[PDB]
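Researcher: Can you fold this with zinc ion in place?
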Amino acid sequence: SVPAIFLDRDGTINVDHGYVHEIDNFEFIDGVIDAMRELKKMGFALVVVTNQSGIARGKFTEAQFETLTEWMDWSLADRDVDLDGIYYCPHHPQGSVEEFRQVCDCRKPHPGMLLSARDYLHIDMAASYMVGDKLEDMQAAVAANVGTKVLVRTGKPITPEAENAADWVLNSLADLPQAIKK
Ligand SMILES: [Ca+2]
Ligand SMILES: [Zn+2]
């Protein structure tokens, strides 16, 4: 099998401005591209797992999300960071867009995306890490049996509940490689 770093996006990889769907509003957090490179060098698979309820809300389309994700995927690959999987949940139970309106198994804190990635890539879960800025990230990880749950300070002023559920709290994903090496 392979160990993985599971990655939230908004608040973790990019600055969370709310329903980010435009290239011109996608801002990589300082140091995270370099950190992801290092994580790849240290033998981790990298898997994005992102809730994208803006699709169900009609803030933007799945077409627009794919355009952005393609761009993000190239941008990283061009910086020697080759993502192993990108999983997203377009769903919301109250979605205005019928196609995406539903309770689902993939919306964090449900561990669905992490389980799919596990089965696809043959991921060693106990040897893996989840990194996110929200409670829902930590809860998805515990459910999927992710060995280490890492909260970051780059998004939402963290809640006590999110901090409670996390194993580690780091300022940024940029700090992860050094934390793992230590
Ligand atoms: Ca987030
Ligand atoms: Zn879903």
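Model: Folded with zinc ion in place. The domain at 1-182 is CATH 3.40.50.1000 (Rossmann fold).
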